[PDB]
Amino acid sequence: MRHISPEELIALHDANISRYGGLPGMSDPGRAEAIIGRVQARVAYEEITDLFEVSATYLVATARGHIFNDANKRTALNSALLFLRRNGVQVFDSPELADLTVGAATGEISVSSVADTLRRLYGS
């Protein structure tokens, strides 16, 4: 599978910050490498192969990780779907994405549950 590197997350976030607005920068030096590195190590360590479980992991870690001073939710949803697109799964906007992303961010919707929705929305 293709992954999103910490550096790509920073860039995905910076473009979003400039296109949609928000306060710039990371909340703490090297926090993207810390969280995303751990996301990929979790995937490798738990041997996660389902693309939707992996995507949801990106979504949840970023929604709640507060890597950036702003645009954490937006970067979470975008990184999660960019992940799927990069791995052959076609993605499109949906009325559920906002609530789903807010629920991931608040801790009300778990990774597996985020993954289920995504498996329905974009699964085969």
Partner: protein, 67 residues
């Protein structure tokens, strides 16, 4: 963790770092400010790594498990 005021830290710094290298954690206080700590980088890095592992884990605990 011994505590030392600002002036004592500016006044005995070489030996603060020696003690610190020898494994000590030294708090530095400033009248009217938040205290700092000087500790070996190796120890700090190991503590920060564990704090980040913990923060990361907490991300996967829903509001249900917590609690």
């Amino acid at each position: 963790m011994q505590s030392i005021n600002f002036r004592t830290a500016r006044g005995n710094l070489s030996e603060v770092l020696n003690n610190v290298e020898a494994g000590e954690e030294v708090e530095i206080t400033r009248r009217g400010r938040e205290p700092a700590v000087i500790v070996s980088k190796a120890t700090f890095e190991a503590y920060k790594k564990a704090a980040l592992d913990a923060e990361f884990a907490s991300l996967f605990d829903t509001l249900d498990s917590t609690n």
